[PDB]
Protein backbone atom coordinates (compact mmCIF):
# COMPACT_ATOMS: atom_id res chain seq x y z
CA UNK A 1 0.00 0.00 0.00
CA UNK A 2 1.69 3.12 -1.33
CA UNK A 3 2.10 6.03 1.14
CA UNK A 4 -0.12 8.48 -0.80
CA UNK A 5 -1.49 9.61 2.58
CA UNK A 6 2.00 10.94 3.39
CA UNK A 7 2.01 12.93 0.11
CA UNK A 8 -1.58 14.25 -0.12
CA UNK A 9 -2.58 14.48 3.58
CA UNK A 10 0.75 15.89 4.85
CA UNK A 11 1.01 18.41 7.73
CA UNK A 12 3.08 20.94 5.74
CA UNK A 13 3.95 21.54 2.10
CA UNK A 14 7.16 23.03 0.72
CA UNK A 15 7.47 26.40 -0.93
CA UNK A 16 7.44 26.33 -4.73
CA UNK A 17 10.95 27.71 -4.99
CA UNK A 18 12.10 24.64 -3.04
CA UNK A 19 9.72 21.80 -3.82
CA UNK A 20 9.71 18.37 -2.22
CA UNK A 21 10.32 15.15 -4.14
CA UNK A 22 9.21 11.83 -2.54
CA UNK A 23 9.85 8.56 -4.45
CA UNK A 24 7.02 5.97 -4.18
CA UNK A 25 8.25 2.36 -4.72
CA UNK A 26 7.90 -1.30 -3.66
CA UNK A 27 4.13 -0.93 -3.01
CA UNK A 28 0.57 -1.12 -4.32
CA UNK A 29 -0.74 2.14 -5.72
CA UNK A 30 -4.51 2.60 -5.83
CA UNK A 31 -5.22 5.62 -8.03
CA UNK A 32 -8.99 5.21 -8.10
CA UNK A 33 -9.17 6.29 -4.45
CA UNK A 34 -7.61 9.67 -5.35
CA UNK A 35 -9.50 10.29 -8.59
CA UNK A 36 -13.13 9.78 -7.50
CA UNK A 37 -12.47 12.04 -4.54
CA UNK A 38 -14.51 15.28 -4.74
CA UNK A 39 -11.93 17.02 -2.59
CA UNK A 40 -9.74 17.80 -5.65
CA UNK A 41 -10.36 20.99 -7.70
CA UNK A 42 -8.47 19.68 -10.68
CA UNK A 43 -7.05 16.43 -12.02
CA UNK A 44 -5.29 17.01 -15.30
CA UNK A 45 -3.40 13.92 -16.40
CA UNK A 46 -1.01 13.85 -19.34
CA UNK A 47 0.17 10.95 -21.44
CA UNK A 48 -2.25 8.61 -19.68
CA UNK A 49 -5.94 8.03 -19.24
CA UNK A 50 -6.59 8.92 -15.52
CA UNK A 51 -9.03 6.04 -15.33
CA UNK A 52 -6.68 3.33 -16.64
CA UNK A 53 -3.89 3.97 -14.10
CA UNK A 54 -5.41 1.39 -11.81
CA UNK A 55 -4.48 -1.28 -14.37
CA UNK A 56 -0.95 -0.11 -15.00
CA UNK A 57 2.35 -0.68 -13.17
CA UNK A 58 5.41 1.53 -13.34
CA UNK A 59 9.13 1.47 -12.37
CA UNK A 60 9.40 4.67 -10.23
CA UNK A 61 6.58 7.16 -9.42
CA UNK A 62 8.03 10.47 -8.10
CA UNK A 63 5.62 12.73 -6.22
CA UNK A 64 6.45 16.40 -6.10
CA UNK A 65 4.75 18.85 -3.76
CA UNK A 66 4.47 22.66 -3.33
CA UNK A 67 2.09 25.57 -2.52
CA UNK A 68 1.09 28.12 -5.21
CA UNK A 69 -1.71 30.63 -5.93
CA UNK A 70 -4.88 29.48 -7.71
CA UNK A 71 -4.16 31.70 -10.75
CA UNK A 72 -0.88 29.91 -11.27
CA UNK A 73 -2.17 26.37 -11.20
CA UNK A 74 -2.52 26.45 -14.99
CA UNK A 75 1.27 26.88 -15.22
CA UNK A 76 1.85 23.40 -13.85
CA UNK A 77 1.58 21.71 -17.22
CA UNK A 78 3.84 20.71 -20.16
CA UNK A 79 4.33 23.36 -22.82
CA UNK A 80 3.32 26.21 -20.50
CA UNK A 81 5.26 29.37 -19.66
CA UNK A 82 5.03 31.92 -16.85
CA UNK A 83 6.68 33.19 -13.67
CA UNK A 84 6.40 29.81 -11.97
CA UNK A 85 6.79 27.60 -14.99
CA UNK A 86 9.98 29.36 -16.08
CA UNK A 87 11.76 30.01 -12.77
CA UNK A 88 10.33 27.75 -10.06
CA UNK A 89 8.98 24.45 -11.40
CA UNK A 90 9.13 23.28 -14.99
CA UNK A 91 7.71 20.17 -16.63
CA UNK A 92 9.14 18.72 -19.89
CA UNK A 93 7.14 18.76 -23.13
CA UNK A 94 7.04 14.95 -23.09
CA UNK A 95 5.86 14.85 -19.48
CA UNK A 96 3.86 11.80 -18.45
CA UNK A 97 1.99 12.00 -15.17
CA UNK A 98 -0.88 13.60 -13.23
CA UNK A 99 -1.17 17.14 -11.90
CA UNK A 100 -3.44 17.14 -8.88
CA UNK A 101 -4.49 20.19 -6.91
CA UNK A 102 -6.99 21.37 -4.34
CA UNK A 103 -8.03 24.51 -2.48
CA UNK A 104 -6.35 24.87 0.92
CA UNK A 105 -7.71 28.24 2.08
CA UNK A 106 -8.72 26.65 5.37
CA UNK A 107 -5.15 25.40 5.92
CA UNK A 108 -2.37 27.71 4.56
CA UNK A 109 -3.96 31.08 5.31
CA UNK A 110 -4.49 33.05 8.48
CA UNK A 111 -5.62 36.46 9.61
CA UNK A 112 -3.09 39.15 8.73
CA UNK A 113 -1.33 36.98 6.11
CA UNK A 114 0.58 33.67 5.82
CA UNK A 115 3.93 34.79 4.38
CA UNK A 116 5.84 31.55 5.12
CA UNK A 117 5.67 30.31 1.48
CA UNK A 118 8.11 31.76 -1.03
CA UNK A 119 8.43 31.84 -4.86
CA UNK A 120 11.37 32.93 -7.00
CA UNK A 121 10.76 36.18 -8.80
CA UNK A 122 14.21 36.80 -10.24
CA UNK A 123 16.43 34.34 -12.10
CA UNK A 124 19.09 34.92 -14.76
CA UNK A 125 17.59 32.37 -17.15
CA UNK A 126 14.76 29.87 -17.49
CA UNK A 127 15.43 26.66 -15.61
CA UNK A 128 15.47 23.13 -17.03
CA UNK A 129 12.72 20.51 -16.48
CA UNK A 130 12.68 19.19 -12.89
CA UNK A 131 15.54 21.46 -11.90
CA UNK A 132 15.54 22.78 -8.36
CA UNK A 133 17.34 26.00 -7.54
CA UNK A 134 17.50 27.14 -3.95
CA UNK A 135 20.33 29.70 -4.19
CA UNK A 136 19.62 32.90 -2.22
CA UNK A 137 22.15 35.24 -3.90
CA UNK A 138 21.20 38.87 -4.68
CA UNK A 139 19.93 39.36 -8.25
CA UNK A 140 21.52 42.11 -10.32
CA UNK A 141 18.93 43.85 -12.47
CA UNK A 142 21.13 46.35 -14.30
CA UNK A 143 24.71 46.97 -15.42
CA UNK A 144 25.72 48.23 -11.90
CA UNK A 145 27.45 45.54 -9.63
CA UNK A 146 25.58 44.65 -6.39
CA UNK A 147 28.48 42.79 -4.72
CA UNK A 148 26.03 40.54 -2.83
CA UNK A 149 24.40 43.34 -0.74
CA UNK A 150 20.82 44.48 -1.61
CA UNK A 151 20.63 48.18 -2.61
CA UNK A 152 20.45 50.07 -5.91
CA UNK A 153 18.78 48.11 -8.69
CA UNK A 154 19.56 44.68 -7.08
CA UNK A 155 17.05 42.55 -5.10
CA UNK A 156 16.63 39.42 -3.04
CA UNK A 157 15.30 36.77 -5.53
CA UNK A 158 12.34 35.50 -3.48
CA UNK A 159 8.91 36.93 -2.57
CA UNK A 160 6.00 36.12 -0.28
CA UNK A 161 2.53 35.02 -1.19
CA UNK A 162 0.32 37.16 1.02
CA UNK A 163 -2.27 34.47 1.72
CA UNK A 164 -5.34 35.71 3.70
CA UNK A 165 -8.82 34.15 4.46
CA UNK A 166 -10.45 36.86 2.38
CA UNK A 167 -8.42 36.58 -0.85
CA UNK A 168 -10.19 36.25 -4.18
CA UNK A 169 -10.19 32.71 -5.51
CA UNK A 170 -7.24 33.42 -7.81
CA UNK A 171 -5.23 34.54 -4.79
CA UNK A 172 -6.17 31.66 -2.50
CA UNK A 173 -3.54 28.97 -1.73
CA UNK A 174 -3.60 25.69 -3.61
CA UNK A 175 -1.72 22.55 -2.73
CA UNK A 176 -0.21 20.83 -5.73
CA UNK A 177 0.96 17.24 -6.08
CA UNK A 178 2.53 16.03 -9.29
CA UNK A 179 2.79 12.31 -9.87
CA UNK A 180 5.40 11.67 -12.56
CA UNK A 181 5.18 8.26 -14.27
CA UNK A 182 8.03 6.37 -15.98
CA UNK A 183 13.11 -2.61 -16.76
CA UNK A 184 11.32 -4.30 -13.73
CA UNK A 185 8.28 -2.49 -12.32
CA UNK A 186 7.72 -1.95 -8.57
CA UNK A 187 4.53 0.11 -8.31
CA UNK A 188 1.48 -1.89 -9.46
CA UNK A 189 -2.26 -1.32 -9.08
Amino acid at each position, epitope marked *: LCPFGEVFNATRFASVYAWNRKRISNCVADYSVLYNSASFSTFKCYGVSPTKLNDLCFTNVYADSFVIRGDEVRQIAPGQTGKIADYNYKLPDDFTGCVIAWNSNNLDSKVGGNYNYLYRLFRKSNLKPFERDISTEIYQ*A*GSTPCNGVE*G*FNC*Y*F*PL*QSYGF*QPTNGVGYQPYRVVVLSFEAPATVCG
Partner: antibody
Framework: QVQLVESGGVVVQPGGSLRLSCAAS????????MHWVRQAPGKGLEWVSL????????HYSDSVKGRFTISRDNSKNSLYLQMNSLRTEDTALYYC???????????????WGQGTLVTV | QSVLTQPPSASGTPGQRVTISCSGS????????VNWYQHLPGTAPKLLIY???QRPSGVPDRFSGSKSGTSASLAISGLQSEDEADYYC??????????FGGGTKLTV
Protein backbone atom coordinates in the same frame (compact mmCIF):
# COMPACT_ATOMS: atom_id res chain seq x y z
CA GLN B 1 -3.78 40.30 -3.45
CA VAL B 2 -1.84 43.51 -2.66
CA GLN B 3 -3.62 46.58 -1.35
CA LEU B 4 -2.53 50.11 -0.57
CA VAL B 5 -4.92 52.64 0.96
CA GLU B 6 -4.21 56.38 1.05
CA SER B 7 -5.88 59.01 3.25
CA GLY B 8 -5.46 62.68 4.23
CA GLY B 9 -7.06 64.04 1.02
CA VAL B 10 -8.12 67.46 2.36
CA VAL B 11 -7.87 71.07 1.19
CA VAL B 12 -5.23 73.23 2.84
CA GLN B 13 -4.77 76.96 2.37
CA PRO B 14 -1.45 77.68 0.54
CA GLY B 15 1.46 78.07 2.89
CA GLY B 16 -0.08 75.55 5.33
CA SER B 17 0.84 71.88 6.02
CA LEU B 18 -0.66 68.37 5.54
CA ARG B 19 0.16 64.71 6.45
CA LEU B 20 -0.83 61.70 4.33
CA SER B 21 -0.89 58.07 5.42
CA CYS B 22 -0.85 54.83 3.33
CA ALA B 23 -1.97 51.63 4.97
CA ALA B 24 -0.47 48.56 3.38
CA SER B 25 -1.49 44.90 3.37
CA UNK B 26 -1.21 41.67 1.36
CA UNK B 27 2.62 41.71 1.26
CA UNK B 28 5.66 41.89 3.47
CA UNK B 29 6.03 45.48 4.56
CA UNK B 30 9.17 45.57 6.67
CA UNK B 31 11.38 44.20 3.93
CA UNK B 32 10.12 46.54 1.21
CA UNK B 33 11.12 49.96 -0.07
CA MET B 34 8.26 52.33 -0.87
CA HIS B 35 7.63 55.50 -2.84
CA TRP B 36 5.26 58.45 -3.24
CA VAL B 37 4.18 59.54 -6.66
CA ARG B 38 1.90 62.45 -7.61
CA GLN B 39 -0.20 63.35 -10.62
CA ALA B 40 -0.93 67.01 -11.23
CA PRO B 41 -4.38 67.48 -12.85
CA GLY B 42 -4.24 67.39 -16.64
CA LYS B 43 -0.61 66.24 -16.51
CA GLY B 44 1.51 63.10 -16.21
CA LEU B 45 3.14 61.26 -13.33
CA GLU B 46 5.80 62.75 -11.10
CA TRP B 47 8.08 60.97 -8.70
CA VAL B 48 8.27 62.39 -5.15
CA SER B 49 10.20 60.18 -2.69
CA LEU B 50 11.25 56.70 -1.67
CA UNK B 51 12.10 55.38 1.75
CA UNK B 52 14.06 52.12 2.02
CA UNK B 53 12.97 49.39 4.44
CA UNK B 54 15.59 50.12 7.10
CA UNK B 55 15.43 53.87 6.61
CA UNK B 56 18.99 53.53 5.31
CA UNK B 57 18.64 55.90 2.41
CA UNK B 58 16.03 58.54 1.79
CA HIS B 59 15.74 60.55 -1.39
CA TYR B 60 13.58 63.44 -2.50
CA SER B 61 12.79 64.90 -5.85
CA ASP B 62 14.33 68.36 -6.15
CA SER B 63 10.93 70.05 -6.31
CA VAL B 64 10.02 68.84 -2.83
CA LYS B 65 13.50 68.65 -1.40
CA GLY B 66 13.83 70.33 1.97
CA ARG B 67 10.08 70.68 2.53
CA PHE B 68 8.65 67.17 2.31
CA THR B 69 9.47 64.45 4.79
CA ILE B 70 8.84 60.73 4.32
CA SER B 71 8.78 58.23 7.17
CA ARG B 72 7.53 54.73 7.93
CA ASP B 73 6.41 52.55 10.80
CA ASN B 74 7.01 48.89 10.15
CA SER B 75 5.06 47.79 13.21
CA LYS B 76 1.85 49.24 11.79
CA ASN B 77 2.44 48.42 8.12
CA SER B 78 2.04 52.09 7.26
CA LEU B 79 3.88 54.74 5.26
CA TYR B 80 3.68 58.46 6.10
CA LEU B 81 4.29 61.73 4.19
CA GLN B 82 4.66 65.05 6.02
CA MET B 83 4.41 67.90 3.55
CA ASN B 84 5.12 71.39 4.89
CA SER B 85 5.34 74.80 3.20
CA LEU B 86 2.71 73.96 0.64
CA ARG B 87 2.61 75.64 -2.79
CA THR B 88 -0.38 75.87 -5.13
CA GLU B 89 1.86 73.87 -7.55
CA ASP B 90 1.48 70.78 -5.33
CA THR B 91 -2.16 70.20 -6.27
CA ALA B 92 -2.33 66.61 -7.35
CA LEU B 93 -3.56 63.08 -6.94
CA TYR B 94 -1.09 61.39 -4.62
CA TYR B 95 -0.35 57.70 -4.97
CA CYS B 96 1.29 55.08 -2.74
CA UNK B 97 3.49 52.50 -4.48
CA UNK B 98 6.05 49.76 -3.69
CA UNK B 99 9.22 48.37 -5.31
CA UNK B 100 9.55 44.97 -7.08
CA UNK B 101 11.63 42.86 -4.73
CA UNK B 102 12.76 42.65 -1.13
CA UNK B 103 15.71 44.65 0.18
CA UNK B 104 16.66 46.50 -3.01
CA UNK B 105 15.25 49.69 -4.51
CA UNK B 106 14.80 51.60 -7.75
CA UNK B 107 11.37 52.92 -8.84
CA UNK B 108 7.56 52.51 -8.24
CA UNK B 109 6.71 49.04 -9.51
CA UNK B 110 3.74 46.74 -9.39
CA UNK B 111 1.24 47.61 -6.65
CA TRP B 112 -0.07 51.17 -6.76
CA GLY B 113 -2.78 52.54 -4.52
CA GLN B 114 -5.97 54.26 -5.63
CA GLY B 115 -4.50 57.48 -4.27
CA THR B 116 -6.14 60.55 -2.82
CA LEU B 117 -6.72 64.09 -4.08
CA VAL B 118 -4.90 66.90 -2.33
CA THR B 119 -6.09 70.44 -3.06
CA VAL B 120 -3.98 73.42 -1.91
CA GLN C 1 8.96 70.81 -18.90
CA SER C 2 10.11 67.10 -18.48
CA VAL C 3 13.44 65.13 -18.75
CA LEU C 4 12.48 62.00 -20.71
CA THR C 5 10.99 62.81 -24.10
CA GLN C 6 7.96 61.08 -25.51
CA PRO C 7 5.59 62.03 -28.34
CA PRO C 8 2.28 63.48 -27.06
CA SER C 9 0.33 60.86 -28.96
CA ALA C 10 0.36 57.68 -31.05
CA SER C 11 -2.29 55.79 -32.99
CA GLY C 12 -3.12 52.73 -35.09
CA THR C 13 -5.72 50.32 -36.45
CA PRO C 14 -6.52 47.08 -34.52
CA GLY C 15 -4.32 44.25 -35.72
CA GLN C 16 -1.41 46.61 -36.38
CA ARG C 17 1.74 47.06 -34.34
CA VAL C 18 2.66 50.51 -33.07
CA THR C 19 5.63 51.85 -31.15
CA ILE C 20 6.09 54.50 -28.51
CA SER C 21 9.50 56.08 -28.42
CA CYS C 22 11.26 57.55 -25.36
CA SER C 23 14.50 59.46 -25.31
CA GLY C 24 16.79 60.88 -22.68
CA SER C 25 20.34 61.78 -21.75
CA UNK C 26 23.36 59.65 -21.00
CA UNK C 27 22.48 59.67 -17.24
CA UNK C 28 18.89 58.63 -17.71
CA UNK C 29 18.69 55.81 -20.14
CA UNK C 30 22.23 55.47 -21.34
CA UNK C 31 23.38 54.11 -17.95
CA UNK C 32 20.33 52.74 -16.03
CA UNK C 33 17.25 50.64 -16.67
CA VAL C 34 13.92 51.56 -18.16
CA ASN C 35 10.49 50.86 -16.84
CA TRP C 36 7.21 51.38 -18.64
CA TYR C 37 3.79 51.87 -17.11
CA GLN C 38 0.31 51.77 -18.47
CA HIS C 39 -2.23 54.20 -17.05
CA LEU C 40 -5.91 53.86 -17.88
CA PRO C 41 -7.78 57.06 -16.83
CA GLY C 42 -10.00 56.45 -13.80
CA THR C 43 -7.77 53.89 -12.08
CA ALA C 44 -4.20 53.38 -10.81
CA PRO C 45 -1.15 52.96 -13.12
CA LYS C 46 0.30 49.47 -13.56
CA LEU C 47 3.78 48.26 -14.47
CA LEU C 48 4.10 46.90 -17.97
CA ILE C 49 7.79 46.50 -18.60
CA TYR C 50 10.71 46.59 -16.23
CA UNK C 51 14.47 46.38 -16.57
CA UNK C 52 14.33 47.24 -20.28
CA UNK C 53 12.62 44.07 -21.59
CA GLN C 54 11.22 42.00 -18.69
CA ARG C 55 7.58 41.50 -17.77
CA PRO C 56 5.69 41.09 -14.46
CA SER C 57 3.00 38.46 -14.07
CA GLY C 58 -0.30 39.41 -15.77
CA VAL C 59 1.34 41.23 -18.71
CA PRO C 60 0.90 39.40 -22.09
CA ASP C 61 3.56 38.96 -24.78
CA ARG C 62 1.78 41.57 -26.89
CA PHE C 63 3.88 44.02 -24.92
CA SER C 64 7.64 44.11 -25.50
CA GLY C 65 10.39 46.70 -25.32
CA SER C 66 14.07 47.27 -25.83
CA LYS C 67 16.96 49.59 -25.13
CA SER C 68 19.55 50.79 -27.62
CA GLY C 69 22.35 53.07 -26.47
CA THR C 70 20.48 56.06 -25.00
CA SER C 71 17.03 55.49 -26.46
CA ALA C 72 14.15 53.17 -25.64
CA SER C 73 10.86 52.06 -27.10
CA LEU C 74 7.72 50.10 -26.29
CA ALA C 75 6.21 47.91 -28.98
CA ILE C 76 2.51 47.11 -28.77
CA SER C 77 1.22 44.33 -31.05
CA GLY C 78 -2.31 43.08 -31.75
CA LEU C 79 -3.82 46.38 -30.67
CA GLN C 80 -7.17 45.88 -28.92
CA SER C 81 -9.70 48.61 -28.12
CA GLU C 82 -9.03 47.95 -24.43
CA ASP C 83 -5.50 49.40 -24.62
CA GLU C 84 -6.52 52.99 -25.31
CA ALA C 85 -4.49 54.45 -22.45
CA ASP C 86 -1.58 56.72 -21.50
CA TYR C 87 1.84 55.07 -21.50
CA TYR C 88 4.81 56.29 -19.45
CA CYS C 89 8.60 55.84 -19.62
CA UNK C 90 10.81 56.10 -16.52
CA UNK C 91 14.57 55.94 -15.80
CA UNK C 92 16.46 56.82 -12.58
CA UNK C 93 18.85 59.74 -13.17
CA UNK C 94 22.13 60.02 -11.28
CA UNK C 95 22.24 63.81 -10.73
CA UNK C 96 18.48 64.18 -10.85
CA UNK C 97 16.21 61.71 -9.07
CA UNK C 98 13.36 59.50 -10.27
CA UNK C 99 12.27 60.49 -13.72
CA PHE C 100 9.01 60.01 -15.51
CA GLY C 101 8.46 61.05 -19.11
CA GLY C 102 5.72 63.34 -20.38
CA GLY C 103 3.51 60.39 -21.36
CA THR C 104 2.09 59.24 -24.70
CA LYS C 105 -1.64 59.03 -25.42
CA LEU C 106 -2.25 55.96 -27.60
CA THR C 107 -5.53 55.88 -29.48
CA VAL C 108 -7.27 53.27 -31.69
Amino acid sequence: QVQLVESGGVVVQPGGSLRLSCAASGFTFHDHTMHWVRQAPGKGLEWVSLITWNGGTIHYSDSVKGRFTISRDNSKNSLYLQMNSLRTEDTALYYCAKDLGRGGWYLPSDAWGQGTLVTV
Amino acid sequence: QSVLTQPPSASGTPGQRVTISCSGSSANIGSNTVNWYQHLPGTAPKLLIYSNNQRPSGVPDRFSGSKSGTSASLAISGLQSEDEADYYCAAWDDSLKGVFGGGTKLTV
